[PDB]
Amino acid sequence: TMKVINDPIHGHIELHPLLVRIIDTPQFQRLRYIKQLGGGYYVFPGASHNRFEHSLGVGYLAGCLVHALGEKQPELQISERDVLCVQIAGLCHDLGHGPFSHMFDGRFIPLARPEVKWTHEQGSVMMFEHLINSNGIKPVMEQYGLIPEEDICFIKEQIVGPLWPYKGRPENKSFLYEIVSNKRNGIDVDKWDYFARDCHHLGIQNNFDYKRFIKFARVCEVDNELRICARDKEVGNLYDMFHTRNSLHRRAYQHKVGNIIDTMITDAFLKADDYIEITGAGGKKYRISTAIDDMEAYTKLTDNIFLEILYSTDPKLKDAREILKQIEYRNLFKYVGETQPTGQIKIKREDYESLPKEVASAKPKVLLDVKLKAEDFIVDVINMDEQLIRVYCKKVDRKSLYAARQYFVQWCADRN
Amino acid sequence: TMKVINDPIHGHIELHPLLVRIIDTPQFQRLRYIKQLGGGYYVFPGASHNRFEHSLGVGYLAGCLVHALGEKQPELQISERDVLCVQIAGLCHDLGHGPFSHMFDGRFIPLARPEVKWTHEQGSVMMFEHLINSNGIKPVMEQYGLIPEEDICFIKEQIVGPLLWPYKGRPENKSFLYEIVSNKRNGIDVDKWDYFARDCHHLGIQNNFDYKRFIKFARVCEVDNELRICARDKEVGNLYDMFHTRNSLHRRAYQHKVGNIIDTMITDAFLKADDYIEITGAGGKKYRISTAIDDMEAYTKLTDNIFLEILYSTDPKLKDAREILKQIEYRNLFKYVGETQPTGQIKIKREDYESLPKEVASAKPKVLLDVKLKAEDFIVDVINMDYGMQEKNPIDHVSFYCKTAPNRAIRITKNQVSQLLPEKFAEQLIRVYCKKVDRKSLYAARQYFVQWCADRN
Amino acid sequence: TMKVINDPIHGHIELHPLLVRIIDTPQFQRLRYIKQLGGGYYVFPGASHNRFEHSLGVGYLAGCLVHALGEKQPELQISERDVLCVQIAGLCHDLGHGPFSHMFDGRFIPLARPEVKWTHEQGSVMMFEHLINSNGIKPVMEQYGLIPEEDICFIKEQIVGPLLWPYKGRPENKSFLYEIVSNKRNGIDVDKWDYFARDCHHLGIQNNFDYKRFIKFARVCEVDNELRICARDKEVGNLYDMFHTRNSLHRRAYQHKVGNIIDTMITDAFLKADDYIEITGAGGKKYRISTAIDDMEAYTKLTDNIFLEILYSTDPKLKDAREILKQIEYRNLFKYVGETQPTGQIKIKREDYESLPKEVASAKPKVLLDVKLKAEDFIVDVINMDYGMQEKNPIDHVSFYCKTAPNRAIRITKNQVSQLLPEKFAEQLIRVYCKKVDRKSLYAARQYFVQWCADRN
Amino acid sequence: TMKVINDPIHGHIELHPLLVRIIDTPQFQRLRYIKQLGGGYYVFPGASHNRFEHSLGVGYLAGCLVHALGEKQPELQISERDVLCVQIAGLCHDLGHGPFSHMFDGRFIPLARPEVKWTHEQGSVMMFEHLINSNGIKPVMEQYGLIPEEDICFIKEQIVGPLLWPYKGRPENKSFLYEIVSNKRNGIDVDKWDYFARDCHHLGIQNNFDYKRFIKFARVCEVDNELRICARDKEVGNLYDMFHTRNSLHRRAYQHKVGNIIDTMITDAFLKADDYIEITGAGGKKYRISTAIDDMEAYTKLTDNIFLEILYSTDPKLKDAREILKQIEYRNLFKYVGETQPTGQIKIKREDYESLPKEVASAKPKVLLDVKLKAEDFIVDVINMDEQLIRVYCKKVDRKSLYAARQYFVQWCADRN
Ligand SMILES: Nc1nc2c(ncn2[C@@H]2O[C@H](COP(=O)(O)OP(=O)(O)OP(=O)(O)O)[C@@H](O)[C@H]2O)c(=O)[nH]1
Ligand SMILES: Nc1nc2c(ncn2[C@@H]2O[C@H](COP(=O)(O)OP(=O)(O)OP(=O)(O)O)[C@@H](O)[C@H]2O)c(=O)[nH]1
Ligand SMILES: Nc1nc2c(ncn2[C@@H]2O[C@H](COP(=O)(O)OP(=O)(O)OP(=O)(O)O)[C@@H](O)[C@H]2O)c(=O)[nH]1
Ligand SMILES: Nc1nc2c(ncn2[C@@H]2O[C@H](COP(=O)(O)OP(=O)(O)OP(=O)(O)O)[C@@H](O)[C@H]2O)c(=O)[nH]1
Ligand SMILES: Nc1ncnc2c1ncn2[C@H]1C[C@H](O)[C@@H](COP(=O)(O)OP(=O)(O)OP(=O)(O)O)O1
Ligand SMILES: Nc1ncnc2c1ncn2[C@H]1C[C@H](O)[C@@H](COP(=O)(O)OP(=O)(O)OP(=O)(O)O)O1
Ligand SMILES: Nc1ccn([C@H]2C[C@H](O)[C@@H](COP(=O)(O)OP(=O)(O)OP(=O)(O)O)O2)c(=O)n1
Ligand SMILES: Nc1ccn([C@H]2C[C@H](O)[C@@H](COP(=O)(O)OP(=O)(O)OP(=O)(O)O)O2)c(=O)n1
Ligand SMILES: [Fe+3]
Ligand SMILES: [Fe+3]
Ligand SMILES: [Fe+3]
Ligand SMILES: [Fe+3]
Ligand SMILES: [Mg+2]
Ligand SMILES: [Mg+2]
């Protein structure tokens, strides 16, 4: 029968029997040990939450929103099948994340294997496919009157993008595909869910109230294309929600210490590659930077890798252990300066590795005595959604910092 | 040099430079990966807080309380050194916890090494001593003017009991310092307030007690030739309500049925796989899980990782542990059979636990059953619900003072407060669980449990 | 056409057009000037909420609960007519309250006219009848399918009660509808949760009960040829927590000594000021404050404006009342002497209240005091504090059901729950106050009080 | 001994005995019957608070802020005397308010007596002077080492405007004190935080501002050879967020439509009720509602009870006010005629409020209009936001008048360009 589960943000939540059947599986439970903020735990001790409750809340919000929208307009003929499909799509929307969520996808894979284009959402859809294939849930889905063949696709295109390429549901129900992932707006249930969770755990007071937005949701035909919007007097609501988004990003998501900590973690991970063997399908062994291409190995890849590197004794991981000890000792590198991103051009992901060579090869003009190689500089790209560039140096000496300042200023002007 | 940290419960905390040096060491940072609630996560998905925040909050509360008391009564002659020592003692009051907090020192240790009785207090004592010795904090402590020889022993005696006036760290005219962080004469201390606040904030439950009022109504006056901390005579109801809140939290969250089941399953998984594990210690030596408590460096590497490490194990020797953990993952748990009317007129002892399943198996039900069970097919757990002093009345040992005479201490009995208070102050529960899941097995287990209960008080 | 109201406690409140039609009426907007806690606003500076939002919240909660019960069980033949009836009945459940809420019907009326029994529920019923008779609401009620003949009688029954099975508005199979707004059997209703939340929010004291969990586990099952609202068998602890929270909130806020003394002196001022205030009634007549209950038109314009009118009036006929109110303004209150211990092994009946001043004055102290105190300088208060059932255990009358038998009712006694429950459910309290202010008078009053308390056991 | 009072915003508070003595007087205890938001209670049923707790919180916040500033900078030579002076002055910064605290000074007095300037700060300061004079507070003020003669002037200058250095209470060394209770330099003072927090809590909206952070990061440094309050450079975003909260509050609650029309109609009811009710005054004299401010012994008798008195009075001479209040209570309010385009200057002067209703009636729109509407049917509302904005209302509710009224308004705005 129905099952009830609580949560700090929302109240008691009801779960469909099929949803709980999906939940109880190792692949989904793997989210139990991935931190929401990833590397932010080491600056704000309140960000101790995982992705499990995030997924549960996103699913609950999607279900409630769709039910409320369908209640007040019974002439759209929305069936329980649509509700279940959208709830399932929302529930498994973040299965592809690796250790610490964002950083692994955004800084590690593009650095270890530049020639491969990878995004955590593609990994999420691959993981969902493997999950549904490996656990025999399809007969259960058929039991509850839900057609597997079409609905599996429906979910697949609900989570990721496919003059109408969609092939899951005809145009008469085109308003469903923008509930969990809205292409032209970017505001969905996931947005509100993770905002609420982040402000609650960090301690920042929120300003938005999604319950009002649900209370004033209506759907009507626009250009032969059903759309969802609210009344015109919610301008203040939208403005304060966007202000909260900007404040949250500026305060937490771009904190200097958190990002440099993520940089240290990814440097330790990449330096320790080619020494860790992870069991995969058929006994095949994979590296941490290569496991992305298989799901059996990726299942056993979580935040535990960092701790495992920390508490190993093999002599082949000496550098990684030293870096991890240094972060634990709060002997954290140094910040030099900030860039000037001017050109409309965007630094392509696979061009990061060139950047240290470019900065090192740059010839300073000011009187500099110490010459530094290209192995003692770190540069990172921050995608503001603008692009920001920050620089860090291996050395901590004041004189070395002065030389690093000259290299950065000359190079920054050189690249316009 | 001053530093600031944010918390979700309180505001922004401030740490002395010595606290900054102490905090950023591997021994203390080890706590970052120990869950506060332990086995309660799997039932309350919001309980994702470790011991680091708890320690920080306890330290802050102790510092604030001592500062307030020093400000109210300037005649006590309380110097900055006393405040710093109290703060440091408060910070490191839970260093000795093992994996899953109470798991290690409540269920595993008694079952793996029944020849010893170990509690996390002296483990924390050893950990703190090792930290101080190995991280070379003595020169900085001296540089700040604090005296190591006396104050280190003062802190050590603060975390644990005395080991006639037995204390030796500080003279008798400062005896009110020994009941700020850890209190034995009564349960009043900052730790209780801090964990109340954090647990009720994260779980999703609403608390009733607020510590600001009690801190605002604090005073010290001599009692029995001893300086103590007394509360105003009108707050007895507040203390009774606070202890009722403690009991409510224990009944609601910490002692959930499924939480205790997952606790016991993880304990069994740890027990069945200890031989095929090695932890490097001092001088390259290796220790088992159970024997790791005798070497501090080997102990430092013992955290929540071991759970998933067994989950991700590949050697054939860990097959049973991996199977049990996967059985947990599929959420195929032991099925609860039935509770019994609270105990009776007896009190089952600590060493009699192993007998109960034998008794249940030996029970002979009147109605013949198609399924016959064995001694290892039943799990019996006993829960001790009390007010923190094993059937004694905690309020009786608290000194109160009146507004008319703010320098006299009086004790208020039970009859002078109300007539709506519990008659007793402690009770014991009996839980029975079956390791089989088939309907016939559950029916047989219920019949056997009813038979045994009828053959019992 | 559905209106929306912003409530700081709940979210957005949605009202049927008939409900908003009812709201906007003088006999209802009268409630905007009746403070909830009476004199408590002078001790707790955060309690100023009136009865208007309280009634709105009660109605909204009743609507939500009935909607949930209808949703989880569509076999009850529940319709929109019943929902509207319940909402309207619950929205006007406290119409008859006089100035300062409970003070008027607890301290004033018993003294002014002790020869008539009056409870504010009957006042609310008669005020509702006045509303219906005056505002011509019957046609709009008919326009929405409501049949006044039965609907109005049913709404009346839901407020007070009966007026085999005495009810006539609805058949037996809908008997559970009477236990939603005000329950006479065990005492669980939306009013409790509403006022708990509102008072705990406004005063500044955290609450402990969350009604969401209770409504989640709500169900209706047959009980002795009669349908009733029943809770899950695992929820007893939370019900006891609810009752404990109610009692604690009572003892903490609703019976504060300063609040009670302020209320008593305001009642004394009102009684002294009687026979000099005229309020226009029906047909241009004149009614006294004590006689203002016979005609509802006069009773309509009786709000707390009377307090300020008496305070600020320059009429020489009310000089004593003006002096008393200037004294309560100046914080020259009557002093507090002491409180006896519960005499609840044998209760004190209502009619003996006026004797206590005589008894305390007649008691002869042994220590001789120069100042002599008469029976006119002593004020005696009696406080009745309990679970609201006069030694009867409310939980004993609540039906429970198990998971595997969703259509069977079982009763749980006190023993099977826990042995930490209170032994005594109700008791009595007594206070004594000295009108005079000089130190010698307080000393003599304390001596007299201790002598009397020792004399009466 | 010191006293403790519970406040659901700042929690428990510590009160000096002198402030307790000040509180326990009628001149201050009367503020328990004045609603903070005035007419707002009829649109948001959760805003029932009164100015008493607002004053308490403002005093406590000022005391705490000055205490922290003195603690973290001992070089300023701050004594308990100045701390007490600031605390009491802040406690008595909102004492002169009339009924609803904004209807009276906002619209009523400038209409009935449009030739006398009146700001409620002036009433507050003079009523404070009367309170200190008429309750024997000078001996107590002397008991606690507080010099009366200079400190009363210091408090007055703190409450009312300053009236090269114009101040007299203290020399230039303590020049940062006057900016605490009333900050005319940048507009940040404890009063703003207090009433923002109280309104946000009671209305049912979440505010993200935190004054404790500012107190932690605030200090005073010598700038331009004088002392001004300065903060760190990393909390600019926090200040901008606070400004956003202020703007949202003003645009959401303080300027609500129905509340504004309710306040205007209440002002009309009071205006009509004038000349009929008398308030006893000093020496047994009688004063009218409009003239009650001249002798503040009577002004102490002006509370929100006037509304109830008008509603429940049976004098035949109060008929019009009676049915106006009954219309208020029946939800039959005035109808929103139009909204102004306040471009150009549109800076209505305080002395021309009564002229605008007559001017709007004099407009001649270029449309056929058989019906005739008199200037008394048109109501002109002026509110300053910081920009000026204007609106008009029609007493009549028939459809024909609604159409007719629109033509005059557009014509007048066109006439005003
Ligand atoms: N040291 C330390 N800081 C923490 C911790 N948790 C959160 N923080 C916060 O993170 C911030 C970053 O610390 P640091 O890397 O030392 O940077 P900083 O605070 O500017 O100090 P410096 O780099 O030495 O100038 C601190 O200021 C703390 O407020 C912790 O566990 N240890
Ligand atoms: N199934 C499941 N429950 C969870 C999870 N996280 C927290 N819970 C809670 O833990 C409780 C475990 O209950 P059940 O899984 O139903 O097991 P049970 O208590 O024996 O009840 P039955 O399934 O009916 O036998 C649930 O009621 C949930 O509210 C989760 O990830 N999966
Ligand atoms: N004096 C005063 N107290 C208030 C006011 N508002 C709320 N209170 C609270 O009400 C309580 C009443 O206490 P007291 O005035 O001291 O009188 P008491 O409690 O009988 O004790 P005594 O001071 O000996 O008279 C105070 O402690 C305040 O916390 C107010 O406006 N004036
Ligand atoms: N009806 C009503 N509304 C109230 C009351 N108290 C506060 N309000 C709020 O005040 C608002 C104003 O309601 P109206 O007088 O009808 O103003 P209006 O919405 O412009 O007029 P309509 O469009 O006809 O509803 C309502 O939406 C309520 O949210 C009350 O007692 N009755
Ligand atoms: N008293 C309580 N207050 C708040 N949350 C609670 C309480 N009891 C349990 N919870 C939480 C624990 C889980 O997160 C969720 C479900 O708990 P609970 O109702 O005990 O389910 P259960 O699985 O133990 O029982 P059932 O046998 O009825 O399925 O609610
Ligand atoms: N249980 C309580 N919890 C929180 N605040 C309370 C409680 N009881 C009272 N308060 C508030 C009321 C006032 O705001 C302030 C003072 O109350 P309280 O301490 O009870 O004073 P009192 O009048 O009983 O005694 P006294 O005059 O001796 O201080 O605290
Ligand atoms: N049966 C229990 C008892 C408590 N806890 C956990 C919940 C709290 O977060 C933590 C409290 O930590 P402490 O032991 O330091 O606090 P106490 O002093 O209250 O513990 P105790 O009274 O048992 O000594 O213990 C638990 O998991 N299960
Ligand atoms: N000294 C006080 C102060 C508060 N109350 C008010 C607040 C509570 O909401 C209510 C008590 O609740 P009960 O269950 O005893 O009955 P009610 O008074 O709520 O019924 P009604 O809704 O008719 O007021 O009375 C009180 O009883 N007396
Ligand atoms: Fe997500
Ligand atoms: Fe602890
Ligand atoms: Fe009520
Ligand atoms: Fe103000
Ligand atoms: Mg369950
Ligand atoms: Mg007092």
Supply the DSSP string of B65-118, one letter for each residue.
Answer: HHHHHHHH-GGG---HHHHHHHHHHHHTTTTT-BTTBHHIIIIIHHHH-TT---
| DSSP for A49-117, written as a single string | -BHHHHHHHHHHHHHHHHHHHHHH-GGG---HHHHHHHHHHHHTTT-S-BTTBHHIIIIIHHHHSTTS-
Cα–Cα distance for residue pair C456/C436, rounded to 1 Å: 25
Cα–Cα distance for residue pair D396/D384, rounded to 1 Å: 27
Pairing of strands B226-232, C12-15: unpaired
Helices (H), B273-382: 296-300, 305-311, 319-329, 355-362
Cα–Cα distance for residue pair B261/C132, rounded to 1 Å: 60
Cα–Cα distance for residue pair A266/A289, rounded to 1 Å: 11
Full 3-state SS string of chain C:
CCEEEECCCCCEEEECHHHHHHHCCHHHHHHHHCECCHHHHHCCCCCCCEHHHHHHHHHHHHHHHHHHHHHHCCCCCCCHHHHHHHHHHHHCCCCCCECCEHHHHHHHHHHHCCCCCCCHHHHHHHHHHHHHHHHCCHHHHHHCCCCHHHHHHHHHHCCCCCCCCCCCCCCHHHHHHHHCCCCCCCCCCHHHHHHHHHHHHHHCCCCCCCHHHHHHCCEEEECCCCEEEEEECCCHHHHHHHHHHHHHHHHHHHCCHHHHHHHHHHHHHHHHHCCCCCEECHHHCEECCCCCCCCHHHHHCCCCHHHHHHHHCCCHHHHHHHHHHHHHHCCCCCEEEEECCCCCCCCCCHHHCCHHHHHHHHCCCCCCCCCCCCCCCEEEEEEEEECCCCCCCHHHHCCEEECCEEEEEECCCCCCCCCCCECCCEEEEEEEEECCCCHHHHHHHHHHHHHHHHHCC
| DSSP for B182-210, written as a single string | S-SSSS-SHHHHHHHHHHHHHHT------
Neighboring chain D residues of B11 at a CB cutoff of 8 Å: 212
Cα–Cα distance for residue pair D181/D33, rounded to 1 Å: 24
Helix (H) or strand (E) holding B13: strand B12-15
Rounded to a whole number, what is the distance in Å from the CA of B11 to chain D's nearest CA?
A: 8
What residues are paired with D378 via a beta bridge? D394
Catalytic choice (D16, D120, D130, D201): D120
Cα–Cα distance for residue pair B138/B149, rounded to 1 Å: 10
- Cα angle value D187/D188/D189 (rounded, 5°): 115
Cα–Cα distance for residue pair B211/B216, rounded to 1 Å: 9
Q: Are D4 and D14 in contact (CB under 8 A)?
A: yes
The whole-angstrom distance between residue C101's C-alpha and the CA centroid of its chain comes to 8
What residues are paired with D286 via a beta bridge? D280
C-beta B329 within 6 A of ligand 2:
no
- Cα angle value D233/D238/D243 (rounded, 5°): 120
Structure tokens at D121: 């700060």
- Cβ count within 10 A of residue B422: 19
Cα–Cα distance for residue pair D55/D198, rounded to 1 Å: 11
Enumerate residues 6+ apart whose C-beta is below 8 A from C1.
Answer: C17
Structure tokens at A104: 């692994």
Structure tokens at C336: 């507090």
Structure tokens at B384: 């001790």
Structure tokens at D273: 């009720």
Helix (H) or strand (E) holding A383: strand A377-383
Q: Write the burial class of residue B48 (CB in 10 Å: 0-12 exposed, 13-18 middle, 19+ buried).
A: buried
What residues are paired with B426 via a beta bridge? B386
Pairing of strands A226-229, A218-221: antiparallel
- Cα angle value A179/A181/A184 (rounded, 5°): 95
CB contact under 8 A, C48 and D50: yes
Cα–Cα distance for residue pair D32/D351, rounded to 1 Å: 32
Cα–Cα distance for residue pair A264/A262, rounded to 1 Å: 5
Nearest by CB to A215, from C12, C212, C213: name it: C12
Cα–Cα distance for residue pair C69/B222, rounded to 1 Å: 60
Neighboring chain B residues of D11 at a CB cutoff of 8 Å: 212
Structure tokens at A317: 């991981």
Helix (H) or strand (E) holding B228: strand B226-232
Is C234 an 8 Å CB contact of chain A?
no
Cα–Cα distance for residue pair C36/C200, rounded to 1 Å: 13
SS3 content of chain D, % helix, strand, coil (to 5): 55, 10, 35
Distance in angstroms between the alpha carbons of the first and the last residue of chain B: 65
Q: Are C314 and C331 in contact (CB under 8 A)?
A: no
Distance in angstroms between the alpha carbons of the first and the last residue of chain D: 65
Q: Which amino acid is at C418?
A: S
Cα–Cα distance for residue pair C160/C154, rounded to 1 Å: 11
Structure tokens at D336: 């929103």
CB contact under 8 A, A26 and B326: yes
- Cβ count within 10 A of residue C251: 17
Structure tokens at B50: 């470790």
Q: Are B157 and B168 in contact (CB under 8 A)?
A: yes
The whole-angstrom distance between residue C391's C-alpha and the CA centroid of its chain comes to 19
Tell me the three state secondary structure of residue D224. Answer: coil
Helix (H) or strand (E) holding D7: strand D3-7
The 8 Å CB, 24+ separation contacts for D314-318 are: D314/C280, D315/D276, D317/D276, D318/D273, D318/D276
C233 alpha carbon, closest ligand: 5
Q: Which amino acid is at B284?
A: G
| Helices B319-329/B257-272 angle, 10° precision | 160
Q: Please, what's the b/e burial string for C92-110 (b: 16 or more CB within 10 A of its CB; e: otherwise)?
A: bbbbbbbbbbebbbebbbe
Cα–Cα distance for residue pair C313/C323, rounded to 1 Å: 11
The 8 Å CB, 24+ separation contacts for D102-108 are: D102/D38, D102/D263, D103/D38, D103/D39, D103/D263, D103/D266, D103/D267, D103/D270, D106/D263, D106/D267, D107/D263, D107/D264, D107/D267, D107/D353, D108/D267, D108/D270, D108/D271, D108/D290
- Cβ count within 10 A of residue B227: 15
Pairing of strands B335-336, B426-434: antiparallel
Q: Choose among A100, A110, A133: nearest CA to A27.
A: A133
| DSSP for D305-349, written as a single string | HHHHHHHH---GGGHHHHHHHHHHHTT---EEEEE----S-----
Determination approach: cryo-EM
Catalytic choice (A120, A130, A200, A249): A120
In the reported structure, the alpha carbon of residue A43 is separated from the centroid of ligand 1 by a whole-number distance in angstroms of: 7
Cα–Cα distance for residue pair A161/A177, rounded to 1 Å: 9
- Cβ count within 10 A of residue D147: 12
Query: Half-sphere exposure of C42 toward its Cβ, with a 13 Å CA cutoff?
Result: 20
| Helices C190-203/C236-249 angle, 10° precision | 50
Cα–Cα distance for residue pair A255/D237, rounded to 1 Å: 14
The sign of the torsion formed by the CA atoms of B101, B103, B106, B108 equals: negative
The whole-angstrom distance between residue C341's C-alpha and the CA centroid of its chain comes to 26
Cα–Cα distance for residue pair A165/A183, rounded to 1 Å: 14
Q: Choose among C105, C18, C5: nearest CA to C60.
A: C5
Tell me the three state secondary structure of residue D33. Answer: helix
Pairing of strands B400-401, C219-222: unpaired
CB contact under 8 A, B48 and A48: yes
Full 3-state SS string of D351-410:
HHCCHHHHHHHCCCCCCCCCCCCCHHHEEEEEEECCCEEEEEEECCCCHHHHHHHHHHHH
Tell me the three state secondary structure of residue A183. Answer: coil
Helix (H) or strand (E) holding A263: helix A256-271
B contact test, residue of A307, A309, A313 with most B CBs within 10 A: A307
Cα–Cα distance for residue pair C351/C179, rounded to 1 Å: 32
Neighboring chain D residues of A244 at a CB cutoff of 8 Å: 208
Q: Choose among A348, A341, A353: nearest CA to A377.
A: A353
Q: What is the CA radius of gyration of chain B?
A: 24
In the reported structure, the alpha carbon of residue B43 is separated from the centroid of ligand 2 by a whole-number distance in angstroms of: 7
Catalogue all structural domains in chain A, each as residue range(s) with its CATH number: 3-253 (1.10.3210.10), 335-414 (3.30.70.2760)
DSSP A31: G
Cα–Cα distance for residue pair D220/D227, rounded to 1 Å: 6
Q: What is the resolution of this structure in A?
A: 3.4
Cα–Cα distance for residue pair C102/C339, rounded to 1 Å: 23
Enumerate residues 6+ apart whose C-beta is below 8 A from D239.
Answer: none
| Interface contacts (B, D; CB < 8 Å) | 10
Cα nearest neighbour of B415 on chain C: C341
CB contact under 8 A, D237 and A250: yes
Chain B, residues 50-109, CB within 8 A of chain A, namely 50, 52-53, 56
Cα–Cα distance for residue pair D138/D132, rounded to 1 Å: 7
Cα–Cα distance for residue pair C124/C119, rounded to 1 Å: 9
Cα–Cα distance for residue pair D378/D340, rounded to 1 Å: 14
What residues are paired with D6 via a beta bridge? D12
Is B120 catalytic? The answer is yes
- Site of tokens 């594990």: B277
SS3 content of chain A, % helix, strand, coil (to 5): 55, 10, 35
Q: Which amino acid is at D167?
A: Y
